[PDB]
Amino acid sequence: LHKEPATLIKAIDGDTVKLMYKGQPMTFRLLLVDTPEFNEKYGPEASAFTKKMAENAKKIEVEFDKGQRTDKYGRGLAYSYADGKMVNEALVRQGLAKVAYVYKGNNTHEQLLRKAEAQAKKEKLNIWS
Ligand SMILES: Cc1cn([C@H]2C[C@H](OP(=O)(O)O)[C@@H](COP(=O)(O)O)O2)c(=O)[nH]c1=O
Numbered sequence: 001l002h003k004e005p006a007t008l009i010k011a012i013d014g015d016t017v018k019l020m021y022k023g024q025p026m027t028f029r030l031l032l033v034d035t036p037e038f039n040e041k042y043g044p045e046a047s048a049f050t051k052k053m054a055e056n057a058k059k060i061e062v063e064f065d066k067g068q069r070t071d072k073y074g075r076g077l078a079y080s081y082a083d084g085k086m087v088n089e090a091l092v093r094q095g096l097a098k099v100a101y102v103y104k105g106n107n108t109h110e111q112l113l114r115k116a117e118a119q120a121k122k123e124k125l126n127i128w129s
């Protein structure tokens with residue numbers, strides 16, 4: 001997989017962000033995770049976590065997997081990095097997302113994320129509390 005440039009347009013919620021990619025605005029949905037919706041428990045904390053990580057970053061990058069790059073709603077499907085740190089992994093590591101939506105052929109980082117989830121669950125963090 002390859003990291004490609006993007007710039008932040010706007011935080012949306014814990015697992016979706018609006019980025020400019022190849023010079024076009026697009027909403028990205030983060031691969032392999034599910035955050036609570038804003039109206040659900042930990043939703044506001046997940047949204048805040050992603051917003052801070054994206055807004056504080058000097059450099060945002062997106063990394064597509066091997067499979068589908070767009071979902072049925074036209075959202076890009078990627079892993080996103082803020083100053084080299086994977087946002088997807090970070091959310092899971094903090095217990096603010098579950099590993100989810102693991103589809104064959106877009107699952108390169110599944111084991112990395114499941115290891116983070118196991119650590120969050122051992123620490124009883126947030127959704128695992
Ligand atoms: C993360 C991800 C979500 N989706 C679709 C499945 C879900 O469809 P439904 O909307 O029919 O439930 C939806 C969940 O996204 P959200 O968790 O953003 O709501 O996005 C994909 O198709 N591929 C993916 O990799």
Ligand SMILES: [Ca+2]
Nearest residue numbers: 015034035036
């Ligand atoms: Ca969600």
